Coordinates of C-alpha atoms and ligand atoms in Angstrom, one line a residue:
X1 CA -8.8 4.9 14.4
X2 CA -8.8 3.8 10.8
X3 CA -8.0 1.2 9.1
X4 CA -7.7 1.4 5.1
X5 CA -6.8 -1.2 3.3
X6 CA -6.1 -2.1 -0.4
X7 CA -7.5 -4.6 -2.7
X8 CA -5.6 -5.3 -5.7
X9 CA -7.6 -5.7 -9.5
X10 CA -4.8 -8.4 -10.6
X11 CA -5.3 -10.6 -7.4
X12 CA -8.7 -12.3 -9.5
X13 CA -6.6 -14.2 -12.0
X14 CA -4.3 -16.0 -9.5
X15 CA -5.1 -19.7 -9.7
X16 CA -6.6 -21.8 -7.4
X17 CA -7.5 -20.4 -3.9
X18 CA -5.0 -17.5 -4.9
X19 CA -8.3 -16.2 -6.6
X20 CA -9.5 -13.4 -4.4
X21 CA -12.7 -11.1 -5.8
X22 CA -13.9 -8.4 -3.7
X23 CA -16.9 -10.2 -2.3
X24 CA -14.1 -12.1 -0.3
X25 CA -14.0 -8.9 1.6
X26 CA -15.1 -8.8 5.3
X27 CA -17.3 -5.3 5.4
X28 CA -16.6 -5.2 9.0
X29 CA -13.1 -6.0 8.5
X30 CA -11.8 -2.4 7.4
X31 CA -13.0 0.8 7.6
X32 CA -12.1 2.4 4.2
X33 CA -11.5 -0.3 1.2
X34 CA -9.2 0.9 -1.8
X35 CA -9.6 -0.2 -4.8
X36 CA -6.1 -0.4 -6.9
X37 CA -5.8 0.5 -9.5
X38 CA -7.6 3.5 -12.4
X39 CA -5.3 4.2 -15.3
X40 CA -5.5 7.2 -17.3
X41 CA -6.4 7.6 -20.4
X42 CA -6.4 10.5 -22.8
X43 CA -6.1 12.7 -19.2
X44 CA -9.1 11.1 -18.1
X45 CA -9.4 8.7 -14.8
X46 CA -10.4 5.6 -16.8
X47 CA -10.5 1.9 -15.4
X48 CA -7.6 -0.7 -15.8
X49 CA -9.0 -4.5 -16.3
X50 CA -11.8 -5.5 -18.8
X51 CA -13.8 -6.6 -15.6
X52 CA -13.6 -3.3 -13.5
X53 CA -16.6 -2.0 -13.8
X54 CA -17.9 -5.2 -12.4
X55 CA -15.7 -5.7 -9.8
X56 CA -16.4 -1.7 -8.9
X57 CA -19.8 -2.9 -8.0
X58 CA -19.1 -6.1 -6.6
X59 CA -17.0 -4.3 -3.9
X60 CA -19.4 -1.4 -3.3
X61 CA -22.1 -3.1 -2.7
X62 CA -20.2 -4.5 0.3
X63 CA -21.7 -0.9 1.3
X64 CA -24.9 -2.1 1.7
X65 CA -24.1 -4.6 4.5
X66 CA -22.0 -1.9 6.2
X67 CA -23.2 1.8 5.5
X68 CA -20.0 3.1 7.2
X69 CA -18.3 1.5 5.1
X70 CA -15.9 4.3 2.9
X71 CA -14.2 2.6 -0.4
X72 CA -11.8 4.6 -2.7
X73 CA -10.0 4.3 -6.5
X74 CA -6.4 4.7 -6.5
X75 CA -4.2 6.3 -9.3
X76 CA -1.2 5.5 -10.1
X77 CA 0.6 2.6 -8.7
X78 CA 4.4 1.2 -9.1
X79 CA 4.0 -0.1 -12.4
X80 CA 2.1 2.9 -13.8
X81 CA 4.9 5.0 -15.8
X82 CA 5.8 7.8 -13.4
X83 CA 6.4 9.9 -16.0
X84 CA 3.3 9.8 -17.1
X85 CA 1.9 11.5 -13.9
X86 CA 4.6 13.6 -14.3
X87 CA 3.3 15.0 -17.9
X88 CA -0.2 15.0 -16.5
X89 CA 0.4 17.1 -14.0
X90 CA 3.4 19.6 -15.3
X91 CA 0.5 21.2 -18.0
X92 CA -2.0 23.0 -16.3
X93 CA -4.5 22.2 -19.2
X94 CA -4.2 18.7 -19.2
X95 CA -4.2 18.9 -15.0
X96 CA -7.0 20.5 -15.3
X97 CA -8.9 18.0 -17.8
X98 CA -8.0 15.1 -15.5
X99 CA -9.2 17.1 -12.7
X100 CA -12.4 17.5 -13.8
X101 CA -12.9 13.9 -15.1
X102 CA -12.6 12.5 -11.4
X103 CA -15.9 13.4 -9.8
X104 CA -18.4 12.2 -12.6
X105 CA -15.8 8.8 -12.8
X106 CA -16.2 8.2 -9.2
X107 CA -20.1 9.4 -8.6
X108 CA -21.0 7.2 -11.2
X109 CA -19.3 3.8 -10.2
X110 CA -20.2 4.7 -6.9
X111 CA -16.6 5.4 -4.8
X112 CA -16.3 7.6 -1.9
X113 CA -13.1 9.3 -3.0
X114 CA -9.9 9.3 -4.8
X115 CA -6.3 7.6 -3.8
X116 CA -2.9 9.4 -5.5
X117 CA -0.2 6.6 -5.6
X118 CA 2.0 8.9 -7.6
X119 CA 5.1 7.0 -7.4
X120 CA 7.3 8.7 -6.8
X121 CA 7.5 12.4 -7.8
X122 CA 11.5 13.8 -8.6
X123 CA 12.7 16.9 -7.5
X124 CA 11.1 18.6 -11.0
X125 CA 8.0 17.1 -9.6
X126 CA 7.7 18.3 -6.6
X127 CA 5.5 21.8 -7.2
X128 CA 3.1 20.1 -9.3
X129 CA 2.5 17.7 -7.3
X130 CA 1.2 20.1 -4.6
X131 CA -0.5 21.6 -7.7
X132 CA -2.2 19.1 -8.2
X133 CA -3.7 18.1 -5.0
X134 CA -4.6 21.8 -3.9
X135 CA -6.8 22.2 -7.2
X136 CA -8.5 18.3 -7.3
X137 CA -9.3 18.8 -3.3
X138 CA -10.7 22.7 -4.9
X139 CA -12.7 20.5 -7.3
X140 CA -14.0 18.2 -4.4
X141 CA -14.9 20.9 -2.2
X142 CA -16.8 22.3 -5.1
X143 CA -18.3 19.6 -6.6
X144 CA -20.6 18.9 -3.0
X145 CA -21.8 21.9 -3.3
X146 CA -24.5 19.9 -5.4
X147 CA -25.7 18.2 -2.8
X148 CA -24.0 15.2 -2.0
X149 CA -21.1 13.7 0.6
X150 CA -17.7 15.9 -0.4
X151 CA -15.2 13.2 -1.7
X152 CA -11.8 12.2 -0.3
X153 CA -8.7 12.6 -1.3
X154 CA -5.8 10.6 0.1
X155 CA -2.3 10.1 -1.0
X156 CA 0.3 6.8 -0.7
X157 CA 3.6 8.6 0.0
X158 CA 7.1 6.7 0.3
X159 CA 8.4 6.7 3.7
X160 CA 12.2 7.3 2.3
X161 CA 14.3 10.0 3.7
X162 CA 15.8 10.7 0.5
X163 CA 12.2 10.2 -1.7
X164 CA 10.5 12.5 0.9
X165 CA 13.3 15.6 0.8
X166 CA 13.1 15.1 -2.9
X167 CA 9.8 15.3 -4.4
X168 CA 7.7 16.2 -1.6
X169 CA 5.7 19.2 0.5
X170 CA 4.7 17.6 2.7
X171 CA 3.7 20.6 4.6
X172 CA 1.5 21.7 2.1
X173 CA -0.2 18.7 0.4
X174 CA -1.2 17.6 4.2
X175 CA -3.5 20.1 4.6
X176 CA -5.4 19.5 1.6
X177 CA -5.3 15.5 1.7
X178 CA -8.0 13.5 4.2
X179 CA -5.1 11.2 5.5
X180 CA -2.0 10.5 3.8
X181 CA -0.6 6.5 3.9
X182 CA 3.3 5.9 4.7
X183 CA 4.5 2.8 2.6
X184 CA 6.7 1.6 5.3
X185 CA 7.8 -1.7 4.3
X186 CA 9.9 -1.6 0.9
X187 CA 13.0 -0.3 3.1
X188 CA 15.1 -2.9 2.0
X189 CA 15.0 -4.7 -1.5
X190 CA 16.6 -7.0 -3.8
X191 CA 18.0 -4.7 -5.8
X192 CA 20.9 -4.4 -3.1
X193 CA 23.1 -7.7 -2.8
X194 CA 22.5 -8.3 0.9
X195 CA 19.9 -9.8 3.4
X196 CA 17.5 -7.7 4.8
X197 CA 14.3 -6.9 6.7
X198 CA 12.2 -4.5 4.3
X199 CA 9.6 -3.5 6.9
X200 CA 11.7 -2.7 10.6
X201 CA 10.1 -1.0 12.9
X202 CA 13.2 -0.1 14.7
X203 CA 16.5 0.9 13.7
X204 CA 18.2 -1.6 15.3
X205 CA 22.1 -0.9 16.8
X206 CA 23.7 -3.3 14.7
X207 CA 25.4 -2.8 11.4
X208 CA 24.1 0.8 10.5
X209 CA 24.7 4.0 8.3
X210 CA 20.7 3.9 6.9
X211 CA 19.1 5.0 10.3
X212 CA 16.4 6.4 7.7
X213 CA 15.2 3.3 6.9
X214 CA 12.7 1.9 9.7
X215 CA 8.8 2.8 9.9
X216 CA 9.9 4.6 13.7
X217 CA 12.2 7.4 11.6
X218 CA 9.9 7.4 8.6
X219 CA 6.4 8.4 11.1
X220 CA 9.2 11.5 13.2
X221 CA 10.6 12.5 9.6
X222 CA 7.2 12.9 9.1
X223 CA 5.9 14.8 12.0
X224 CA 8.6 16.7 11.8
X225 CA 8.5 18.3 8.1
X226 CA 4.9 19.4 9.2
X227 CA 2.0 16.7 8.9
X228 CA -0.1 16.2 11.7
X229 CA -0.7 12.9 13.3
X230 CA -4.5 13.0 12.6
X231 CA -4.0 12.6 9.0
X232 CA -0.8 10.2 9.5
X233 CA -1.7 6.5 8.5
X234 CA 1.3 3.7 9.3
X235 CA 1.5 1.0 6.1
X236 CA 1.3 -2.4 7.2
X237 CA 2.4 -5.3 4.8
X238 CA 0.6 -8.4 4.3
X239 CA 3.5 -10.2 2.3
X240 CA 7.5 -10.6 2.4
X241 CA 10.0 -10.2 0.4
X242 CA 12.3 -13.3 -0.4
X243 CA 15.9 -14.1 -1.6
X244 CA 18.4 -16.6 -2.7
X245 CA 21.0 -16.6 -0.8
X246 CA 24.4 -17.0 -2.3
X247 CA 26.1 -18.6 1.0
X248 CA 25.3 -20.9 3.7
X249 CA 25.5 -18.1 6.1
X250 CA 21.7 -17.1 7.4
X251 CA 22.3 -14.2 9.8
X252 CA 22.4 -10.5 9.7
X253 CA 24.7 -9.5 5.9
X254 CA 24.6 -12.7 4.7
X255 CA 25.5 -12.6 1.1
X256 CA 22.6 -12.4 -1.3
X257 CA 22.4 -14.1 -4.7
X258 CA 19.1 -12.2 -5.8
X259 CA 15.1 -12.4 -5.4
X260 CA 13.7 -15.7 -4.4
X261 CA 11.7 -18.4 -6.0
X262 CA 8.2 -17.4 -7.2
X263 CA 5.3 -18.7 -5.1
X264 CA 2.8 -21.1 -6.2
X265 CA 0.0 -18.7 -6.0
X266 CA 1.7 -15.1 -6.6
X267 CA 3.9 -16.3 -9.3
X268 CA 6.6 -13.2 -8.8
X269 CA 10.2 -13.8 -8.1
X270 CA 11.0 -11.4 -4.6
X271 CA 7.6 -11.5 -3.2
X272 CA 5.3 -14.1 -1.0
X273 CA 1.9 -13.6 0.1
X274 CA 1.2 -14.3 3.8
X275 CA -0.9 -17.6 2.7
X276 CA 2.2 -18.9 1.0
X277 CA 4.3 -17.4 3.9
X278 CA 2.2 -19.8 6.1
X279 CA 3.2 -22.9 3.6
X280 CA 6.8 -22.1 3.8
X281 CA 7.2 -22.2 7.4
X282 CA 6.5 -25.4 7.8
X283 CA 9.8 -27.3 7.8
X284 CA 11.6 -23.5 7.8
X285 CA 13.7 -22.3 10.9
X286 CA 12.5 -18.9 12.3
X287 CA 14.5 -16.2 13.9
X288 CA 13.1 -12.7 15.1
X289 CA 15.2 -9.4 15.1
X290 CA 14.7 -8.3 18.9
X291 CA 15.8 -4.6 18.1
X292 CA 13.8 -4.5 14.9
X293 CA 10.9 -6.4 16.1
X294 CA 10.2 -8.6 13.0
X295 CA 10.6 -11.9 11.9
X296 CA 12.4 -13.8 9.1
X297 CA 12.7 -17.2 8.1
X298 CA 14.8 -20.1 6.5
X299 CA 14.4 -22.9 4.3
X300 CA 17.2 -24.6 2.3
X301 CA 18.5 -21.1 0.0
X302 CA 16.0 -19.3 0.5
X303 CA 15.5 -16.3 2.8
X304 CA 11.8 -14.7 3.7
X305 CA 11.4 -11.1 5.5
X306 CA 7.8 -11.0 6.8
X307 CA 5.2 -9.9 9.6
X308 CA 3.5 -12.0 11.6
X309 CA 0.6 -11.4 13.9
X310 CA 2.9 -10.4 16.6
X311 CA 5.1 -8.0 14.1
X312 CA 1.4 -6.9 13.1
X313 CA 0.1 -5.7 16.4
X314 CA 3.1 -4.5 17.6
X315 CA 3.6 -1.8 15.1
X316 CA -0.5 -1.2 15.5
X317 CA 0.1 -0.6 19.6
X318 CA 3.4 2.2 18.0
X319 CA 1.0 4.4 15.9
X320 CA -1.4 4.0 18.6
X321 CA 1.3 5.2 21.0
X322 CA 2.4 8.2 19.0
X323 CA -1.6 9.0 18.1
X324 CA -1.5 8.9 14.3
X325 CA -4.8 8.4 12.6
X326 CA -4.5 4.7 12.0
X327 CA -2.8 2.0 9.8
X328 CA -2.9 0.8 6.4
X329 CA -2.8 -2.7 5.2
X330 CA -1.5 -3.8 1.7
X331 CA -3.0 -6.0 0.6
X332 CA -6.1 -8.0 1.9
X333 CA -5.9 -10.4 -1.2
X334 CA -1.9 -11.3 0.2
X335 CA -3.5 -11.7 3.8
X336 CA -5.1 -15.6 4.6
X337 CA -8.5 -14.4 3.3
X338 CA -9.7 -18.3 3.0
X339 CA -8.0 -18.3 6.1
X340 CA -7.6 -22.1 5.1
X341 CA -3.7 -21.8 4.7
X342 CA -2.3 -21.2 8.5
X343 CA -3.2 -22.7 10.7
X344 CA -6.3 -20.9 13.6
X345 CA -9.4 -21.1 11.3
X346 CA -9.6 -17.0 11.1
X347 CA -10.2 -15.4 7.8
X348 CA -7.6 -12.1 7.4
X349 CA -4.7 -13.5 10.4
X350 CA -2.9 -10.4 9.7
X351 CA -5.5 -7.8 9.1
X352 CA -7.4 -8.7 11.9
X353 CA -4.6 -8.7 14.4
X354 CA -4.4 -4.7 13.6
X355 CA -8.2 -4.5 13.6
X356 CA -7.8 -5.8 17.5
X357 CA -5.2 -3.4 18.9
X358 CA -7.0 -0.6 17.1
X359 CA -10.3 -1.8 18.8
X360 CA -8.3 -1.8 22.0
X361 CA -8.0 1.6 24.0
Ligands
LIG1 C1 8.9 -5.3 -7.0 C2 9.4 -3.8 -6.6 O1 10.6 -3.7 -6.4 N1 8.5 -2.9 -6.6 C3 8.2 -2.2 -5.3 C4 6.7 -1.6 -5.4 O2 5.9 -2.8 -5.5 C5 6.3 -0.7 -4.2 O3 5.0 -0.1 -4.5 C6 3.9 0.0 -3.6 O4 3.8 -1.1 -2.7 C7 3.2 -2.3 -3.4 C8 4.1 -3.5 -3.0 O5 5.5 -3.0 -2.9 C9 3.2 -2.1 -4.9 O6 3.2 -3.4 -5.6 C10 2.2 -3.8 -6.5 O7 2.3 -3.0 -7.7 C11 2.3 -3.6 -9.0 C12 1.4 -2.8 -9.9 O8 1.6 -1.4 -9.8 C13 2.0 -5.0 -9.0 O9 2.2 -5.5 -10.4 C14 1.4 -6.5 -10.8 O10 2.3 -7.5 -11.3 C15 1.6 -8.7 -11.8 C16 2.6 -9.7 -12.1 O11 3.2 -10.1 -10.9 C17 0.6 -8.4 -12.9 O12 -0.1 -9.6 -13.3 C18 -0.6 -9.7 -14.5 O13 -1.8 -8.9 -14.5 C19 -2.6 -8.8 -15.7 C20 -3.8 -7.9 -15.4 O14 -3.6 -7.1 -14.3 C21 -3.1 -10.2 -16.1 O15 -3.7 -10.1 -17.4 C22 -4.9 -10.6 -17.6 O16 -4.8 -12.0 -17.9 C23 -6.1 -12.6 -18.1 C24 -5.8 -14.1 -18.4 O17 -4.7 -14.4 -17.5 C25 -7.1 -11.9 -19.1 O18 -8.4 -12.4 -19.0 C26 -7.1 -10.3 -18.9 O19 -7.7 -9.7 -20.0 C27 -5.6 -10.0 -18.9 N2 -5.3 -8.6 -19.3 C28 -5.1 -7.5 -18.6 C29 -3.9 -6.7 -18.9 O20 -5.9 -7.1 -17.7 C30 -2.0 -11.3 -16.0 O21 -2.6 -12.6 -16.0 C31 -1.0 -11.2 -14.8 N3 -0.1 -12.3 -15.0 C32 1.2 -12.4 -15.0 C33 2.0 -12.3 -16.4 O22 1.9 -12.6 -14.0 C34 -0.3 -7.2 -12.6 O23 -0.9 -6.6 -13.8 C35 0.5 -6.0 -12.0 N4 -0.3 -4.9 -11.6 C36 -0.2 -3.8 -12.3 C37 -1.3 -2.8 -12.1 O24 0.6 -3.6 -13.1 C38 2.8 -5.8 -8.1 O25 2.7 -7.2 -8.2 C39 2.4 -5.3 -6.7 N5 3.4 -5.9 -5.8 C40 3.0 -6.5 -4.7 C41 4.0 -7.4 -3.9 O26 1.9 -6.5 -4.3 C42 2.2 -1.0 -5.3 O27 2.4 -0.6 -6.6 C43 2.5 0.2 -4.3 N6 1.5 0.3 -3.3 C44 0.8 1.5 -3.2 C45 0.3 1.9 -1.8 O28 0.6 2.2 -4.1 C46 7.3 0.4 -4.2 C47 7.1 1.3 -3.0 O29 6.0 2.1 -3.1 O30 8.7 -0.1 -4.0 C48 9.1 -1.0 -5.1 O31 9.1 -0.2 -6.3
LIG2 C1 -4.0 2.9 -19.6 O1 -4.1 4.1 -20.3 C2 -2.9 4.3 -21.1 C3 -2.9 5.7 -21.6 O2 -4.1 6.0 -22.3 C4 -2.9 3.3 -22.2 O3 -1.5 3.4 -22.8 C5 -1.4 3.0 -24.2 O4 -2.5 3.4 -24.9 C6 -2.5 3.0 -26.3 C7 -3.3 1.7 -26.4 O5 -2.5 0.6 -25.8 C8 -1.0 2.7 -26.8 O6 -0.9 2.7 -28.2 C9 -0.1 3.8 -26.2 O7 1.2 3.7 -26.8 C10 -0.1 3.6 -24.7 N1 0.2 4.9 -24.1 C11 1.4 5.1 -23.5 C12 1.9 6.5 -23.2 O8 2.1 4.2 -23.2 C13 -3.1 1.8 -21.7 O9 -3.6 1.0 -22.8 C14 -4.1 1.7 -20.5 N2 -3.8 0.5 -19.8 C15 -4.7 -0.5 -19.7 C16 -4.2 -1.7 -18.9 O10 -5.8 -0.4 -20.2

């Protein structure tokens, strides 16, 4: 089993014990360590904060402690202009140029492969998309050929119904990808005026007409358009989303006024990291979705969506049970890695809980 997870460049400037640098990282912890994330830059994979380079070699030379350890670059990312992928990849020039830029970028600051967070591709976007990752894994397979380890090429698709169907091949760009990561846990937002899980394991019979929107339909869509289970990695979060609500009412479709207050640490209005998470309970009432399998929680207006350790292991024992190829975690730097901020003195609660049932048979 595998276990990727991301580290985030951004996660350094957080104040306080926020501050997380890569040689926080346990090198036993995960099996593949992605780095997020490489810009682009006149078509060219370039890096992203003044300090990368640094922090490029801060993290791989967690390497040298564990030699199995794999760690890759991702492109792309939420905030990076989709359209900007989009013009990349629509030209097969400048595809081409960016292509070819990859290799050198990655030999050179010493990653073991590359990580396409193209998010997320339209339904013009769709061919290119495969285009693109049948000719970079072409430049991969060719570029070992001088001797070294080939490099990987993964992918971070959404786990959507509709974002699949639309922009998507998933036939095809499976057998050219190493393993592909399902972002199962932004299923519900903030953006629609309601309370809401975001990462559901389960449907759920209650109140329905999404069906679509649980990690359990997300991995069968999956299986069923044509990937195979061996390359299929399940997304884990490591944070929760929060609200306001706009009513004193708490359970299921209570009203929803907007995103909730920022936390100390992550400073960003709709998100908490687990570490905060852990502050917030205290004093908070907890309830647990039984047909879901996830918990939330309550404190004066505000309402948090999260995982827990249970959550955590229980969706690592579901892609265990339907043999996919592991789980990914995002983030490590959202996870307790001081693990000074809940509670059982254990560095990584929630990363480690997966890292147990994976270890498990
Ligand atoms: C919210 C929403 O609806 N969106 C979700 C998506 O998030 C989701 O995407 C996938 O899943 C992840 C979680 O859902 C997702 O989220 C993360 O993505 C973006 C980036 O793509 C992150 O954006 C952060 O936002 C930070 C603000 O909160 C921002 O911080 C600023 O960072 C800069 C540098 O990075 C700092 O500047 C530096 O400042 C110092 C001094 O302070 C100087 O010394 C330096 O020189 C400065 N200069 C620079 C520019 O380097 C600055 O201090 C800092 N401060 C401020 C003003 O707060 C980060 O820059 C930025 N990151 C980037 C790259 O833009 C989100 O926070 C992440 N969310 C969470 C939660 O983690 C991922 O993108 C994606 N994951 C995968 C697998 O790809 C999608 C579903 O996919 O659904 C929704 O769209
Ligand atoms: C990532 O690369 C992009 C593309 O090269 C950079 O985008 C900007 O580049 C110029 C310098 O800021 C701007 O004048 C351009 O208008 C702008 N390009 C576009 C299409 O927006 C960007 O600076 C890089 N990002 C970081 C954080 O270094």
């Amino acid at each position: 089993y595998k276990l990727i997870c991301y580290y985030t460049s951004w996660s350094q400037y957080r104040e306080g014990d926020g501050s997380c640098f890569p040689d926080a990282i346990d090198p036993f912890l995960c099996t593949h360590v992605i780095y997020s994330f490489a810009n682009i830059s006149n078509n060219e994979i370039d890096t992203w904060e003044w300090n990368d380079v640094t922090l490029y070699d801060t993290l791989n030379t967690l390497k040298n402690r564990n030699p199995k350890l794999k760690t890759l670059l991702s492109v792309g990312g939420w905030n990076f202009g989709p359209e900007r992928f989009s013009a990349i990849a629509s030209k097969t020039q400048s595809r081409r140029t960016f292509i070819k830029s990859v290799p050198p970028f990655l030999r050179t600051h010493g990653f073991d492969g590359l990580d396409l967070a193209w998010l997320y591709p339209g339904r013009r976007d769709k061919r290119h998309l495969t285009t693109l990752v049948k000719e970079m894994k072409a430049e991969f397979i060719r570029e070992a050929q001088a001797g070294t380890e080939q490099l990987l090429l993964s992918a971070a698709v959404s786990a959507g119904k509709i974002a699949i169907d639309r922009g998507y091949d998933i036939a095809q760009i499976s057998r050219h990808l190493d393993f592909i990561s399902l972002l199962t846990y932004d299923f519900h937002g903030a953006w629609r005026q309601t309370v809401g899980h975001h990462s559901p394991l389960f449907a759920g019979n209650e109140d329905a007409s999404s069906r679509f929107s649980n990690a359990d339909y997300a991995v069968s869509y999956m299986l069923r358009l044509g990937a195979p289970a061996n390359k299929l990695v399940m997304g884990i979060p490591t944070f929760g989303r929060s609200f306001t609500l706009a009513s004193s009412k708490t359970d299921v479709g209570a009203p929803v006024s907007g995103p909730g207050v920022p936390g100390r640490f992550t400073k960003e209005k709709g998100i908490l990291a687990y570490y905060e998470i852990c502050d917030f309970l205290h004093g908070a009432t907890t309830h647990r979705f039984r047909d879901q399998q996830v918990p939330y929680a309550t404190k004066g207006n505000q309402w948090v969506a999260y995982d827990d350790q249970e959550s955590v292991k229980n969706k690592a024992r579901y892609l265990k049970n339907r043999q996919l190829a592991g789980a990914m975690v995002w983030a490590l730097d959202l996870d307790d890695f001081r693990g000074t901020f809940c509670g059982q003195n254990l560095t990584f609660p929630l990363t480690s809980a997966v890292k147990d049932v994976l270890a498990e048979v």
